[PDB]
């Protein structure tokens, strides 16, 4: 029903001022995010309004998980989807050093140390996508059901591919609180960049900063 093979395929099919470049890349990746979500089992079957809600609720965490994992072999930096490497010194010199360091310390380095693979990344992102707590969902139980199927498949995968690591499944899930926190902080930064006026923000990224409709 929720084959990790499909999730892995979704990841593989999507594979490609520092702040301005990061925002530029974020807008670009939002289009790709939609294509990725469509490839995730059963997502496109959900009603259109729920698909919108899930993507608007999880895009920032989804994009952060992606560039963090893409940056595993990068030292003290991150690799943007545009091919540009952004080093810690550059982020610090732009005034966003603290949040950049959290990404490196809480996400990139942890993914690197445990050698999180693309299948695991995919499943974690699918879990984030299928967030049953997203407000407005026409049928939260259905999304919750999908989430449960994803983590059931993920745990099965972990136990099979890494039998010598009994805590790997829990380890993967325990990076989600950090991802949630970092995602919220990155969003605050984005809103401030918008507020200041400087830093160009493209249409898709800008649309994500729009208010819902109550």
């Amino acid at each position: 029903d929720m084959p990790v093979e499909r999730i892995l395929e979704a990841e593989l099919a999507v594979e490609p001022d520092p702040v301005t470049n990061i925002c530029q890349a974020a807008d670009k990746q939002l289009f790709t995010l939609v294509e990725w979500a469509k490839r995730i089992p059963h997502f496109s079957e959900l009603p259109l309004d729920d698909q919108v809600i899930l993507l608007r609720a999880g895009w920032n965490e989804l994009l952060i998980a992606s560039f963090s994992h893409r940056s595993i072999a990068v030292k003290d930096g991150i690799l943007l989807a545009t091919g540009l490497h952004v080093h810690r010194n550059s982020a610090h010199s732009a005034g966003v050093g603290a949040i950049f360091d959290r990404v490196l310390t809480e996400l990139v380095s942890k993914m690197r140390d445990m050698q999180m693979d693309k299948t695991e990344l995919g499943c974690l992102r699918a879990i984030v996508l299928f967030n049953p707590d997203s407000k407005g969902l026409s049928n939260p139980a259905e999304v919750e059901a999908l989430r449960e199927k994803v983590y059931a498949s993920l745990e099965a995968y972990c136990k099979h591919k890494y039998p010598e690591q009994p805590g790997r499944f829990a380890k993967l899930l325990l990076r989600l609180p950090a991802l949630r926190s970092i995602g919220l902080k990155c969003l605050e930064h984005l809103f401030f960049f918008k507020l200041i006026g400087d830093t160009p923000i493209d249409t898709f990224l800008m649309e994500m900063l729009e208010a819902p409709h109550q």
Binding site: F31, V34, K38, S44, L48, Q51, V52, L55, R56, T203, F204, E207, E210, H213
Partner: peptide, 11 residues
């Protein structure tokens, strides 16, 4: 509503 996202999901 959210113009761009709807158009992309619809397609």
């Amino acid at each position: 509503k959210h113009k761009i996202l709807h158009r992309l999901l619809q397609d």
